[PDB]
Design a protein around this ligand. Structure first.
Ligand SMILES: NC(=O)c1ccc[n+]([C@@H]2O[C@H](COP(=O)([O-])OP(=O)(O)OC[C@H]3O[C@@H](n4cnc5c(N)ncnc54)[C@H](OP(=O)(O)O)[C@@H]3O)[C@@H](O)[C@H]2O)c1
Ligand SMILES: NC(=O)c1ccc[n+]([C@@H]2O[C@H](COP(=O)([O-])OP(=O)(O)OC[C@H]3O[C@@H](n4cnc5c(N)ncnc54)[C@H](OP(=O)(O)O)[C@@H]3O)[C@@H](O)[C@H]2O)c1
Ligand SMILES: NC(=O)c1ccc[n+]([C@@H]2O[C@H](COP(=O)([O-])OP(=O)(O)OC[C@H]3O[C@@H](n4cnc5c(N)ncnc54)[C@H](OP(=O)(O)O)[C@@H]3O)[C@@H](O)[C@H]2O)c1
Ligand SMILES: NC(=O)c1ccc[n+]([C@@H]2O[C@H](COP(=O)([O-])OP(=O)(O)OC[C@H]3O[C@@H](n4cnc5c(N)ncnc54)[C@H](OP(=O)(O)O)[C@@H]3O)[C@@H](O)[C@H]2O)c1
Lengths: 58, 58, 58, 58
């Protein structure tokens, strides 16, 4: 393997913004490595994205 | 009717947080009055909610 | 304007699938023409997409 | 522990419908046990829900 681990701070690289903590994972044929990210601005709200859409930040 | 109009600043009342501008509307049998809200923290990201989940703020 | 109107049957052109009825609209700088679509397979569930992601079907 | 495992067929118990396979997991304070579910009707589309919202089916 995984690019990210639980608790890593990540953001969407482009397009619609999203930033916060890795809180989970998923895997489909379309998205064989995906992550759930809890917004650091909006506690409790989670969005899921393919790994290629995300980048780790400090 | 409508409780909110385009551009109103709203937030989710409870549970998962969300806050920003009304940017659209939807209507289903389950949700006969729903709104699209663009996060003020994460430009471009939009989430949809029933009217009862939202409250207007200044 | 609008490409679609309320009640039009549409589907996602590519990637993750989605198909059902137009039930609403939204507009942001990133997505100046977007639509809410209620799944015809999963009543009550709605997802939002830019116009370019959707195509009308009979 | 987990209520469900990868590949279990589940559906939303009430409200907006969703049905398909468990494809992932997430954990937040609001949702300490959550699941990602890929629709069996719309390949590639995934939605996330708390465990209490879901039930396993054959
Ligand atoms: N709104 C959007 O467009 C959007 C997009 C992407 C992600 N999300 C994410 O979805 C999450 C919403 O969080 P939340 O605090 O509102 O809700 P939640 O606690 O994540 O619950 C989600 C939904 O599950 C159902 N549910 C929850 N508890 C249940 C129970 N005990 N029994 C039966 N059904 C139950 C309800 O479904 P019904 O509503 O069908 O009744 C509820 O609205 C956030 O993480 C958000 O980011 C939302
Ligand atoms: N991730 C979540 O859990 C979640 C939950 C609720 C709401 N949302 C919302 O969804 C939005 C995502 O925004 P965004 O900037 O990533 O993407 P977007 O511009 O809103 O595009 C959405 C999706 O539509 C498809 N698409 C876009 N342009 C296309 C084109 N020209 N031709 C064919 N298909 C096209 C792509 O589908 P495919 O990916 O299928 O290729 C793309 O990922 C945000 O407003 C976000 O809040 C996300
Ligand atoms: N799960 C996903 O990943 C995802 C992604 C994209 C779109 N969606 C869409 O989101 C919708 C979920 O439908 P649904 O039947 O579960 O739920 P809903 O009726 O659309 O309610 C959505 C959320 O709004 C809040 N809410 C609703 N009524 C409230 C009230 N009376 N007072 C305070 N808050 C209230 C709850 O928030 P909290 O959960 O914060 O308590 C609830 O989970 C579907 O249309 C689905 O497609 C979900
Ligand atoms: N639309 C909704 O309301 C909603 C609600 C809940 C869940 N969802 C879920 O979100 C998923 C959408 O699937 P999908 O096939 O459209 O898209 P995807 O492959 O899951 O990609 C999601 C988004 O990530 C970004 N992205 C993907 N690849 C990228 C790359 N190589 N570089 C930079 N950014 C990249 C794009 O963001 P941008 O659009 O920001 O450019 C894209 O729209 C489905 O599983 C669906 O159920 C959608």
């Amino acid at each position: 393997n995984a690019t990210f681990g639980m608790g890593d701070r990540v953001r969407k690289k482009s397009g619609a913004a999203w930033q916060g903590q890795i809180v989970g994972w998923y895997c489909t044929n379309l998205t064989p490595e995906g992550y759930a990210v809890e917004s650091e601005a909006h506690p409790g709200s989670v969005q899921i994205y393919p790994v290629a859409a995300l980048e780790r930040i400090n």
